[PDB]
Amino acid sequence: GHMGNAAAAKKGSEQESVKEFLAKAKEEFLKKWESPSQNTAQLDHFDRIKTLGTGSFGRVMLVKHKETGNHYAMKILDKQKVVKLKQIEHTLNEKRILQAVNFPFLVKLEFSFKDNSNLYMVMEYVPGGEMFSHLRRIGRFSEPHARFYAAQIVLTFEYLHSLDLIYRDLKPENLLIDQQGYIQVTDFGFAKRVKGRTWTLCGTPEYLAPEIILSKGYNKAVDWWALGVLIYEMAAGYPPFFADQPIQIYEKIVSGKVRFPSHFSSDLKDLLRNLLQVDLTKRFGNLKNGVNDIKNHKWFATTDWIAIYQRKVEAPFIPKFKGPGDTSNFDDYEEEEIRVSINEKCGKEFTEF
């Protein structure tokens, strides 16, 4: 076979240890999921420093806790922009999931609260910037560099999916690079606890699995498709279904044959064909052997999965850090003052937050 007796025994034992870890992780998650925390700070506890990113509902800002001096990233959502039914439900998903998870590559939530106008989530500040801007600046990552990030995503999805959580918005914009060069997944705005299928048409066009575009009930396999898109984009510098307008992107995803750069290794192309697989009975991550079809693939043969989890592997890139509160690794955005209305807005729609 491909493995000798000693290697096969080591791998089997490793796989059983993963099961033991995930069972304990589910016990810890469920305690926090059934007993969430709320209103653990208020706005005047923080000095607001700089906008780090913007979205449709608000912005993420670097803030400084006044009493402790610690820096944090504060996501601010304008309740009156979170108007559509699925926008509201997704915001409650995001907070409840973030407060309950615990994994080395998932951003840690510190506080959450709300006022008359806004919802706030205060998380650990990750100063190395988004993978997105490092990737666009350098062009593409070499295969070993892409593989180091990909392995962290595989482990993070194995963790999330074991808790019945689907992530649904994988992309470089959502992956921050910490001081040791490891990834922090942020932005849980589309994550959801799903025990079988779900039906919301949501995500980012280039990263949508065909079954989402086709209005089919879908499952956690959409995250494995998205991993294929991410690995392709990291290694090529552009994603596999690439067009100016969303409708053109969708047509390529459902009906397009993926083409690969001539510099992709055959091992990489083989992995990507099996992740970017339209047939759900054939997509890696969705078969009887689950995540192990990915972890045991030839492209990952050099990956020490336990060492990645334990953060024992030297990262390919360490961001320059000029001290606490440095924002040099983030792009600049237009600043707009936070206005808190004298009247409560959308109080009933956000009771649970």
Binding site: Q87, L201, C202, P205, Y238, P239, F242, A243, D244, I249
Partner: peptide, 13 residues
Amino acid sequence: AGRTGRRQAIHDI
């Protein structure tokens, strides 16, 4: 030709 800047995620439609 395709989108090179940051990409917004869509909640609906």
